[PDB]
Design an enzyme around this catalytic site. Structure first.
Site, PDB file in Angstrom:
ATOM      1  N   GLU A  20       0.835  -1.215   0.000  1.00 22.76           N
ATOM      2  CA  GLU A  20       0.000   0.000   0.000  1.00 22.76           C
ATOM      3  C   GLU A  20       0.863   1.255   0.000  1.00 22.76           C
ATOM      4  O   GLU A  20       0.408   2.344   0.348  1.00 22.76           O
ATOM      5  CB  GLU A  20      -0.930   0.042   1.213  1.00 22.76           C
ATOM      6  N   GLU A  72     -15.871  12.805  22.580  1.00 18.60           N
ATOM      7  CA  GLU A  72     -14.598  13.329  22.066  1.00 18.60           C
ATOM      8  C   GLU A  72     -14.474  13.336  20.530  1.00 18.60           C
ATOM      9  O   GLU A  72     -13.621  14.033  19.987  1.00 18.60           O
ATOM     10  CB  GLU A  72     -13.453  12.516  22.644  1.00 18.60           C
ATOM     11  N   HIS A 110      -2.622   2.467   8.469  1.00 18.15           N
ATOM     12  CA  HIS A 110      -3.754   1.664   8.001  1.00 18.15           C
ATOM     13  C   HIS A 110      -3.881   0.421   8.867  1.00 18.15           C
ATOM     14  O   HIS A 110      -2.898  -0.276   9.119  1.00 18.15           O
ATOM     15  CB  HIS A 110      -3.578   1.269   6.523  1.00 18.15           C
ATOM     16  N   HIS A 149     -12.969  -3.401   4.621  1.00 19.60           N
ATOM     17  CA  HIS A 149     -11.515  -3.565   4.635  1.00 19.60           C
ATOM     18  C   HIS A 149     -10.893  -2.880   5.848  1.00 19.60           C
ATOM     19  O   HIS A 149     -10.295  -3.547   6.694  1.00 19.60           O
ATOM     20  CB  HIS A 149     -10.915  -3.068   3.312  1.00 19.60           C
ATOM     21  N   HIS A 162      -6.995  -2.789  10.232  1.00 19.48           N
ATOM     22  CA  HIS A 162      -8.280  -3.424  10.019  1.00 19.48           C
ATOM     23  C   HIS A 162      -9.090  -3.308  11.308  1.00 19.48           C
ATOM     24  O   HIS A 162      -9.365  -4.286  12.002  1.00 19.48           O
ATOM     25  CB  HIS A 162      -8.077  -4.861   9.542  1.00 19.48           C
TER      26      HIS A 162
HETATM   27 ZN   LIG Z   1      -5.581  -3.633   4.642  1.00 19.01          ZN
END
Ligand SMILES: [Zn+2]
Ligand SMILES: [Zn+2]
Ligand SMILES: [Zn+2]
Ligand SMILES: [Zn+2]
Ligand SMILES: [Zn+2]
Ligand SMILES: [Zn+2]
Ligand SMILES: [Zn+2]
Ligand SMILES: [Zn+2]
Lengths: 274, 274, 274, 274
Positions: free
Chosen positions: D117, D171, D141, D212, D143
């Site tokens: 990525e 918050e 990133h 995802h 999950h």
């Molecule tokens: Zn991922």
């Protein structure tokens, strides 16, 4: 050092069983793990081997495994305890030259024996060796909580269950494009359930035992653990989604196809066709 | 070493209470644990004993426990803290020659006393000694989250609750074929609830206290912990399944029977008959 | 040793914040914790104090706290990090002789300041000192997950919320017989929310901030942590039960009364009357 | 010491990936993390650099990143393993003078490469540098389980999803007043998904990839981790609330406005208008 407990494979077995314990997948003696080794792995540690290795017959002849060493979890042993006493809870076994039995070279102290699911493990190793040209080296069984829960609510069907798991996290199709085999409920610890599992392992790297748990196969401990963790993560997502009333939207067949194409995997046809 | 904190039994008590804390079963001072020892276990550590052991009467005479040593958790003590200060949170007690009271030989520092559920523990030990010909050595109580949740939604009936727990993970029938006793809700810390628990312990190794928690008995800390962990794992699965709308399929009576036969256990008739 | 980081109170602050982090109650800088000390606690560590203690005014005069030392969490600091760098994330402050401000004697390095909820903390300390004749020493705020979830689904009413929490684990009535105060949603970090909390603290040891979290008061870190943990455990049980469709049975008013009688506590009348 | 594994940035990468692993957000190789460094950060460690740094082209020219060093997670590497072998699982890369590729100065041993990525990361870094005048330094990133679950049940719309997340913990509006961008489902590991993410990053510090996971941007590892943790905590609350049948009450638009005013943030108009 040639302290066998610090070997890559004993350390790897500790890591995998401990991680699975922490995930909540291996209450009591639930679960079992076997890793196929090379002679080269254990040879430097021969000094660590039992002076008098015990011999135990296999349930049936397994000539494909002749002369093959494994490290295995013990029957009735707790994943939680592996880190505390690897020699009590794990053993290194070497299948004899005719595949009729094995010697316990190290560990399984105080008359311990390999996992009661040894038929499921070794027979699955045999099929996975054939299916992957000797790449796969690990069979792992655990009581993956959400996967278990799903077996009470989803159709116990390879296509349906595979498709749902693919939908429950984008990575799933890429991680297990061959999908997840499902058996009927069967009595554990039998050669029936072991061969049935091994048969499913011809077609899938993951096999579900309804109301019980999962079996996974892969080339390394991490890859096999990660395979199960991926399916269980998807299951966890699905359990949340179903608890909230079900999917309002999901990964489409067209998306799964595009995903398969990009990652150069062939998704299980039956699951894709749904 | 003859540092009593490094003894198998102090280490075992730390492991069990710490593990239960991490499971989320023992908020605040919730839960209690007692382990029956032999004189042989504590004799090497006499140098570690309080010079002036405190005497506390028992709630009622318990002659079967005469001269018997135990290691116990303290009243109002937190499972979370046992690992930080075993002597503050645990004690070794030895019941006197008439079973009328005990001396605190080690631990329970700063005027601490054994668990307020001592009647439930010691009376249950008595019944379990009788029921298992002295095999059982541990009584453990914790606030097992999913088991507690289930007591608000399932019929508080031994047969029904047992059958559901058997259905919720394949291993359950094998781990607790005698099933799970259930009491009515009762005021905690009383001899009423203690004897009621002990009475259920004649027939079951697990007893539920609705809206409160569970008691388990077994031969070792690990076996007793694992017993509760198994029932709680099944409960966790059930809570997920029920949250998803209930079982579409489950382990059948015929399957449970086959499982019982294979593992040489006699499943509780009432639960099987459902 | 006179290394202040190894003091009972710095160690206690680390334990509490770390435990709360692990519980999932304190994402990011969520939550704050203040502990009232004695001069006697910090006097041996004066050598550890900043050579040049910073002065910060309080939001309003708090003469009851004149000359009083506290250990506090810092504004924008993460509970997760307290164990890694106690001096960066915690501070020891001492309120001046007129209660108009405080000196930062130790910690809050790199221009850090006490929690933005200092009004809620210090004003609550004042009311709790009055309410418990100086017994209470801790105010703790965290984002207790299930308690928060319940504020979206249960009536935001002291009686209703208290009664449900009492029902959700047997110990609750004994741990918080005065029940749980609930405020309307209010803007955090204000003197409005701080005094509103302090006012509720006159009548309750727990106060809920809907869609936000909880405040607890008690004599020690463990007792205060355990108070919140008890309420949150009950909330966790309730969330499961409600997710399964609600209570089929529960702890009755008569049972709660019997429980109150046995433990010598007077349960909040309004909650009992439901 | 000038052992690079003990540097602030390697230690920070270990902390972040390990914490995310423990949260259950990063099964297998799920997730990736990149941190933009200064030359000044890595210069003292040049002795630790590979003698022969490997060169890899970027997917497209990124001149804004010319001469910029990053520490990154490796493709197919497990967050779980970063703490065990930082050099195997992380790398320090330095983009060349034309932004056409980078050298691997340290780590990514045994022919490992940066995250698949990388387009999403580096393109997002570019947009975030522009959007925050160089303040933001981290793209993360993972999950995030509950966020993922919500993408199956909530409208995949920036306004709707933002508003719900704001409602799910007080918050949230303060932590992400710019809200949460949502993309359509897209094939991972592509420049399409990377630029689409980078485009959303112009307007939001959080971007969701339906079915995802999530991307977050911020000035430091802790701030970025805490941003995601905040959104995921709100998601966790929401999943509970929705599982219980939905909100009976919630944070009102008027409350969100008051909150925005107090904290000097401008809440995303579209989300507020709902
Ligand atoms: Zn991922
Ligand atoms: Zn199993
Ligand atoms: Zn030899
Ligand atoms: Zn209890
Ligand atoms: Zn002596
Ligand atoms: Zn807060
Ligand atoms: Zn001084
Ligand atoms: Zn150099």
């Amino acid at each position: 050092m040639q302290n066998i407990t610090q070997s890559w494979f004993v350390q790897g077995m500790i890591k995998a069983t401990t991680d699975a314990w922490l995930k909540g997948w291996d209450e009591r003696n639930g679960g079992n793990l076997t890793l196929r080794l090379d002679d080269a792995d254990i040879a430097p540690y021969h000094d660590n081997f039992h002076q008098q290795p015990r011999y135990i017959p296999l349930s049936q002849p397994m000539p494909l495994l002749a002369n093959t060493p494994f490290i295995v979890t013990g029957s009735g042993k707790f994943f939680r305890n592996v880190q505390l006493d690897p020699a009590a809870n794990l053993g290194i076994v070497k299948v004899d030259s005719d595949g009729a039995g094995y010697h316990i070279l190290w560990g399984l102290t105080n008359e311990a024996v390999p996992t009661s699911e040894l038929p499921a493990h070794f027979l699955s190793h045999c099929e996975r060796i054939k299916a992957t040209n000797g790449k796969d080296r690990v069979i792992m069984h655990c009581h993956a909580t959400n996967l278990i829960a799903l077996t009470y609510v989803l159709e116990n069907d390879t296509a349906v269950f595979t498709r749902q798991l693919w939908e429950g996290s984008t990575e799933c199709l890429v991680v297990f494009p061959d999908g997840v085999g499902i058996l009927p409920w069967m009595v554990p610890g039998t050669d029936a359930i072991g061969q049935a599992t091994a048969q499913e392992m011809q077609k899938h790297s993951l096999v579900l035992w309804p109301f019980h748990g999962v079996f996974g196969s892969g080339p390394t401990l991490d890859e096999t653990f990660g395979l199960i963790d991926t399916a269980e993560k998807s299951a966890q997502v699905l359990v949340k989604v179903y608890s909230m009333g079900g999917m309002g939207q999901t990964i489409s067949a067209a998306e799964l196809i595009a995903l398969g194409k990009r990652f150069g995997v062939t998704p299980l046809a039956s699951a894709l066709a749904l």
